[PDB]
Amino acid sequence: GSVTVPHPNIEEVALSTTGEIPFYGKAIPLEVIKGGRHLIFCHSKKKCDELAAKLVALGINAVAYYRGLDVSVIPTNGDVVVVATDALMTGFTGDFDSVIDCNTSDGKPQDAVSRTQRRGRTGRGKPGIYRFVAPGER
């Protein structure tokens, strides 16, 4: 079977209906992406376009990264939140306060390594926070 490695360095959270940015039957409270740098994992490219631009309207600098996307994320200054699928990778990431994921890829439930690779992003120097959606998963 698949055995994902643990990770006490990151705090696991359950995304709920609380906030202003709606996201898959869930409401991301800006307190999870606003206030610093955060990475949001999406399963659709069309959502990355609205979800990122919408954040700029909320007051957060958000970027959407995916296959065929231009370098726009800026993790060097200004609270920027990166919302991308598996295109941003993690060659230069790690400086994130938390990662909001939908635990689902292309509509299907994320795979064992998906959260393993997705969780490994926040917690580089401090305790990273990770909020997942999980419609019928636990």
Curated annotation (Swiss-Prot):
<comment type="function">
    <text>Displays three enzymatic activities: serine protease with a chymotrypsin-like fold, NTPase and RNA helicase. NS3 serine protease, in association with NS4A, is responsible for the cleavages of NS3-NS4A, NS4A-NS4B, NS4B-NS5A and NS5A-NS5B. The NS3/NS4A complex prevents phosphorylation of host IRF3, thus preventing the establishment of dsRNA induced antiviral state. The NS3/NS4A complex induces host amino acid transporter component SLC3A2, thus contributing to HCV propagation.</text>
</comment>
<protein>
    <recommendedName>
        <fullName>Serine protease/helicase NS3</fullName>
    </recommendedName>
</protein>
<feature type="region of interest" description="RNA-binding">
    <location>
        <begin position="117"/>
        <end position="128"/>
    </location>
</feature>
<comment type="subunit">
    <text>Interacts with protease NS2. Interacts with non-structural protein 4A; this interaction stabilizes the folding of NS3 serine protease. NS3-NS4A interaction is essential for NS3 activation and allows membrane anchorage of the latter. NS3/NS4A complex also prevents phosphorylation of host IRF3, thus preventing the establishment of dsRNA induced antiviral state. Interacts with host MAVS; this interaction leads to the cleavage and inhibition of host MAVS. Interacts with host TICAM1; this interaction leads to the cleavage and inhibition of host TICAM1.</text>
</comment>
